[PDB]
Design a protein around this ligand. Sequence first.
Ligand SMILES: O=C(O)CNC(=O)C(=O)O
Ligand SMILES: [Mg+2]
Ligand code: NI
Ligand SMILES: [Zn+2]
Length: 331
Amino acid sequence: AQNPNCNIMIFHPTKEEFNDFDKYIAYMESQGAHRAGLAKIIPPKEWKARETYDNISEILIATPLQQVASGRAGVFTQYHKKKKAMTVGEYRHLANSKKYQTPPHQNFEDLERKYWKNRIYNSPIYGADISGSLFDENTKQWNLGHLGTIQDLLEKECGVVIEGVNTPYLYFGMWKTTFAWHTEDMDLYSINYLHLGEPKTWYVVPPEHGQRLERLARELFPGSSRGCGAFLRHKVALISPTVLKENGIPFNRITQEAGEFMVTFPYGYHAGFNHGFNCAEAINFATPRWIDYGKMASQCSCGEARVTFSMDAFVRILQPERYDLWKRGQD
Ligand SMILES: O=C(O)CNC(=O)C(=O)O
Ligand SMILES: [Mg+2]
Ligand code: NI
Ligand SMILES: [Zn+2]
């Protein structure tokens, strides 16, 4: 069995290997990359996402989110308070202000220490989940706006044509902006490209051990767990690496820098934080190997998780027994 310790693998495809996206994912899996739940892909030196980032300041962040924490430093939830619209130029200036800017630090490990010690005492503002793309239309390789759709994959594997669309999302971050522990909708893959700015630190639990994280989370968030049998779908719970280690949960960590891709694999729980002002693009995708994960994915039906239009068909075709109850949650 390849990668039996479930380590995060880093890949350096050549320009020739970067042509065929599906083939390269399957290659990474042949080497055991999926066992970690997360892989890093460094593009060939010949590749670029677009020519420059000099002209992005007028993008609108219609609903910036202030991430307010509750709990203790290593075990907390966050809620998202909606703020007034602002441009990416306005958000960048806010991120660099004395109130929000990255503190002085020695290295990524010092900054990680500072994150976990102090995150709860601040409320950073995240520009998340903005439909759009920063890839140039002429970028032919690993262009996250031109990937094969999940609807087309389901149709190719299973024979059933379904409604829905699959487009990317932009994320504008600042110091301490946080992504809570989650797997993707319907335990899909995700791919994330860090276009510009400061790094993003990731934590990940191997898919084979995801239920260990779930059991810990039920213990640590006992009210939330009574409310919903899949409350990590709400994307609000944080658990620190120190707490994970104290409870014997297998995990790994890695820092993504500008110009690098990360892929998350089906049922790979992940969480993390941004180091300073940055912009990332991400989208969900599927392969043949996803189908079995999609059929078994948990679902939130309490009403909280509320998701995209295209999840309807995935539930309806892959999980017809759950469909009625899940759809009640959506209405
Ligand atoms: O970058 C973020 O805030 C969160 N991203 C992801 O969870 C992802 O790409 O799957
Ligand atoms: Mg602009
Ligand atoms: Ni994710
Ligand atoms: Zn729920």
